[PDB]
Design a protein around this ligand. Structure first.
Ligand SMILES: Nc1ncnc2c1ncn2[C@@H]1O[C@H](COP(=O)(O)OP(=O)(O)O)[C@@H](O)[C@H]1O
Ligand SMILES: [Mg+2]
Ligand SMILES: [Mg+2]
Length: 960
């Protein structure tokens, strides 16, 4: 019955949205935020309010708008302006207060309550009490609470609750016991009264039911003394676990405040204060901290800080940094660290070793901020370089383990190198020059290498960035002994696994002209041969049949070496990739390649299915028939049978260098991990459907066939033919109007373009996805999926510079809805830079895409998902840049940038800057460093502009 209630909603939402289509009315708009709420789609509904604002300033008072937008801090200052310019107005005061109770502003909420007590209104008098109870509860003042509670009806969930709290202070446990169960039922029955159309009160019912069950443990915490540890554990664990915006946690802790004071909680409140900063309530976090210190909001500003609680101070100081005062913050840190080593070296009389180590760990985490801040305030130059390296090395000492510490040191060292390499390129633009540079670079290079290595070993699983960074220093440094020793030392130390991530990069340099570099690679690859042969054969096989002599030569030496322990695997894989190149409306295997029909029960793993952790699935049998996909390149629909039993379908492409597609699928892999690790992105299932890419030569290669998918172009062509609509009708429309369309001025083009849109249906996609759906909660979910997955690939695609996104280059999963990108030819601006028909667009946000989303589309799920995704990216911009750098400066893959014709070092540099700009918000204006939502808005604007879409090559179907 539960999953049966949402179906009626989903269906009515469809007609409700189809109604909005016919005419946007505040009547519908109301019934829309409601139904999107019962359907527990908070953001899609938030979108409906965004539209409600930008079209109807009619529910009026910009303070009521900020209040509905849960921007309480904005609505408060808007209500002051609305009260100081107006009068008393009983309504304006209620809001002025609701802001205060949301903000945890008990001081002002209690003052505003008492100092204004004429309140001739009885409803004003009734609401008043609910709030002034919580305000009094926060301020301690329990006499004020019971006064205001004795005004709250015992018929309300609120009235029944506040008694349970007053009983718990006055130690009336049986009273408190019953009041909870009665408040539960007054809330349970209230969740049926407004059964659907409520605020974040359905999600705040969780906040009240959470607190009530917590208040039943605060009950457990009064007479019979056994569970103090058990209760504090569940309190602590279901807090790191729990995730609820500031406001709720205030109240949640206020329940825990009835028993455990902040001074005993300590870690509990610091974790809370930590969130208040990270969310953006510094004024609140400060007060939390001032309380824990038992010392001033440092009103004595010139004075040093209290060392009494080392952790609290560190918190205060990092809050001070994220706050305004940050030369002041830095300063307090230099001194704090100095006070801390003294309080260690001296105060530690052996019998204190736990305190010693935690004091040493806090210090490390202090130094890492010190170096972080020094770089922030000063940048990288001859003065700060040895200072921060000082701070980091010092952090490396006090924690020994800890990824960040070693990582930071490595990067700083690696950027010490870059600083001078780039400073000497500056000099040579206008003998003892190279000698000092040699000593300069060898100075920072070696420790960087060392750092990256001990950083990697502390990262197992997630170390792609650092692993790649090792390879930059490695490959890039035509080897002077010192560097090579550290590299050899690391390779010995670090696990073999590490290197699997990085195999295509290693292979891209088998034929390294530098003598000392080559040797290690070859040796490393051969060890990666002894264990994990499989992750090597396919790529090594390809390399071994290379026109470039030194490649295939060196490639063979390793294959030879691998026969000494895995011969037939090399042998099988040798032949299987040989026959597949030969093969590259149907083809029977018995005519085309008999050796393949011959194959049974091989030990060769099904292309791109090998990974440790997972039982090897091997090619058991190759299906005798391959469909020939009719195209200009006639790809094949090869299909293999697995040693598990499952089938594995592939696309054998003939004249397409699949190596680029590979590094992209790699980049996507990374991006997927990043989104799986940001809480919100994981909360919303944000991902990119990827697929397997197994290059077979420079000509050919295999591609994983994503099941259940049709090109955007397919779904339309079917719908159009079903509904008797001419496939290219917008097209025929344009030419009938303007036979020379392609030659018109921008102004002239826009008209013709607009004409076509105004005389064709923009639903199609939207509409066929409705008919496709077997139900409507399936329909709704498939939409929610589609919307997100697309915004994901919009942002990522932009950073990649992913051009050429026409209706045959993206497709839709007909079972999840999630969108999927294929054909990664045009990467980086490339498509925009071209001579004939330059793409102005950043990513495809065509009309029928916009239209398949919820109405209120771009405001709702899409845009929100856009900054969430873009957010992640800008944070982890270094990892993203490691990958991208790793195939822009890649030797074999530079051929897709000298195509600006139809040395390269200079071009490659730009391409990479261009990406950094995109990840530091300098992608538009040179000088402004635009924040996420702005940049996102700017981009959505750019993707939507008729002036941009009309200029698109007609194939791109800028009207689909
Ligand atoms: N990974 C994939 N999964 C499913 N189908 C695919 C995949 N890659 C390509 N196709 C199909 O092959 C067709 C033509 O190949 P495509 O990749 O578009 O090459 P090109 O860009 O050279 O035409 C596509 O329109 C699509 O139907
Ligand atoms: Mg294509
Ligand atoms: Mg292409």
């Amino acid at each position: 019955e539960r999953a049966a209630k949402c179906r009626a909603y989903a269906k009515a939402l469809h007609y409700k949205e189809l109604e909005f289509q016919k005419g946007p009315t505040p009547a519908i708009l109301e019934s829309l935020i409601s139904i999107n709420n019962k359907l527990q789609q908070p953001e899609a509904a938030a979108g409906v309010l965004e539209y409600a604002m930008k079209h109807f300033g009619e529910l009026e008072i910009q303070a009521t708008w900020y209040e509905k937008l849960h921007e309480w801090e904005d609505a408060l200052v808007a209500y002051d302006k609305k009260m100081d310019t107006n009068k008393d107005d009983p309504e304006l005061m209620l809001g002025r207060m609701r802001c205060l109770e949301a903000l945890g502003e008990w001081g002002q909420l209690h003052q505003q309550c008492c100092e204004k007590w004429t309140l001739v209104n009885d409803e004003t008098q009734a609401k008043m009490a609910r709030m002034a109870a919580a305000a009094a509860w926060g301020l301690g003042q329990w006499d004020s609470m019971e006064e205001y509670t004795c005004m709250i009806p015992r018929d309300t969930h609120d009235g029944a609750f506040y008694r349970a709290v007053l009983a718990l202070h006055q130690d009336l446990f049986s009273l408190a016991q019953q009041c909870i169960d009665k408040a539960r039922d007054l809330l349970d029955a209230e969740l049926t009264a407004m059964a659907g159309e409520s605020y974040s009160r359905a999600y705040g019912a969780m906040v009240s039911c959470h607190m009530l069950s917590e208040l039943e443990e605060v009950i457990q915490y009064k007479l019979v003394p056994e569970r103090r540890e058990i209760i504090r554990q569940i309190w602590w664990e279901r807090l790191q676990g729990c995730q609820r915006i500031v406001e709720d946690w205030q109240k949640i802790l206020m329940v825990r405040s009835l028993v455990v004071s902040p001074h005993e909680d300590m870690r509990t409140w610091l974790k809370y204060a930590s969130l208040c900063g990270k969310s953006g309530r510094l004024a609140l976090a400060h007060k939390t901290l001032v309380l824990l210190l038992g010392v001033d909001p440092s009103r004595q500003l010139d004075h040093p800080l209290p060392t009494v609680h080392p952790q609290v101070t560190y918190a205060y100081m990092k809050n001070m940094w994220k706050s305004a005062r940050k030369i002041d913050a830095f300063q307090h840190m230099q001194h704090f660290v100095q006070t801390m080593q003294q309080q260690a070296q001296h105060a530690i009389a052996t019998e204190d070793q736990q305190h010693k180590q935690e004091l040493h760990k806090l210090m490390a985490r202090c130094f890492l901020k010190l170096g972080e801040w020094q770089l922030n305030l000063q940048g990288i130059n001859e003065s700060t370089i040895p200072k921060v390296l000082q701070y980091y090395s010092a952090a490396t000492e006090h924690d020994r383990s800890w990824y960040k510490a070693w990582h930071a040191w490595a990067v700083m060292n690696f950027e010490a190198v870059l600083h001078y390499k780039h400073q000497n390129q500056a000099r040579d633009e206008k003998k003892k020059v190279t000698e000092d540079l040699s000593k300069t670079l060898l100075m920072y290079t070696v420790p960087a290498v060392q750092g990256f290595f001990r950083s990697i070993s502390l990262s197992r699983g997630n170390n792609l960035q650092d692993t790649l960074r090792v390879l930059t220093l490695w490959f890039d440094y035509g080897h002077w002994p010192d560097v090579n020793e550290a590299l050899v030392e690391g390779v010995k130390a670090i696990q073999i696994d590490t290197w699997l991530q990085v195999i295509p990069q290693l292979i891209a340099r088998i034929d390294t002209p530098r003598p000392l570099v080559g040797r290690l690679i070859h040796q490393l690859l051969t060890d990666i041969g002894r264990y994990h042969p499989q992750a090597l054969i396919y790529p090594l096989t390809v390399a071994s049949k290379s026109t470039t002599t030194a490649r295939h030569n060196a490639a063979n030496k390793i294959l030879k070496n691998m026969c000494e322990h895995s011969n037939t695997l090399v042998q099988q894989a040798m032949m299987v990739s040989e026959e597949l190149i030969r093969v590259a409306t149907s083809l029977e295997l018995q005519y085309v390649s008999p050796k393949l029909l011959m194959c049974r029960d091989l030990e060769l793993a099904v292309p791109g299915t090998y990974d440790p952790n997972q039982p090897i699935i091997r090619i058991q049998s190759i299906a005798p028939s391959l469909q020939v996909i009719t195209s200009k390149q006639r790809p094949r629909k090869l299909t293999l049978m697995g040693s598990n039993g499952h089938e594995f379908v592939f696309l054998l492409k003939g004249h397409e260098d699949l190596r680029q597609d590979e590094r992209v699928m790699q980049l996507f892999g990374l991006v997927n991990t990043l989104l799986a690790n940001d809480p919100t992105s994981l909360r919303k299932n944000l991902s990119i459907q990827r697929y397997a890419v197994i290059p077979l030569s420079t000509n050919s290669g295999l591609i994983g066939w994503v099941p259940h998918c049709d090109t955007l172009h397919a779904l339309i062509r079917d719908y159009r033919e079903k509904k008797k609509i001419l496939l290219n009708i917008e097209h025929r429309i344009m030419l009938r109007m303007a036979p020379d369309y392609d030659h018109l001025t921008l102004m002239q083009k826009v008209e013709v373009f607009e004409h076509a849109v105004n005389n064709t249906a923009g639903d199609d996609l939207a509409k066929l996805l409705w008919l496709k759906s077997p139900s409507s909660e399936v329909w709704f979910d498939r939409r929610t999926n589609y919307t997100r997955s697309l915004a994901v690939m919009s942002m990522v695609g932009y950073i990649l510079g992913l051009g050429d996104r026409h209706p045959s280059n993206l497709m839709l999963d007909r079972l999840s809805g999630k969108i999927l990108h294929i054909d990664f030819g045009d990467c980086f601006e490339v498509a925009m830079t071209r001579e004939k028909f330059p793409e102005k667009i950043p990513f495809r946000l065509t009309r029928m895409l916009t239209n398949a989303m919820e109405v209120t589309g771009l405001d709702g799920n899409y845009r929100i998902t856009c900054h969430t995704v873009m957010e992640v990216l800008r944070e982890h911009k270094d990892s993203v840049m490691a990958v991208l750098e790793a195939f822009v400066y890649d030797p074999l893959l530079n051929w897709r940038l000298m195509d600006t014709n139809t040395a390269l070092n200079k071009k490659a540099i730009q391409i990479i800057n261009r990406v950094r700009d995109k990840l530091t918000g300098r992608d538009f204006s040179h000088d402004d460093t635009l924040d996420v939502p702005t940049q996102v808005e700017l981009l959505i604007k750019q993707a939507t502009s008729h002036e941009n879409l009309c200029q698109c090559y007609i194939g791109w179907c800028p009207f689909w």
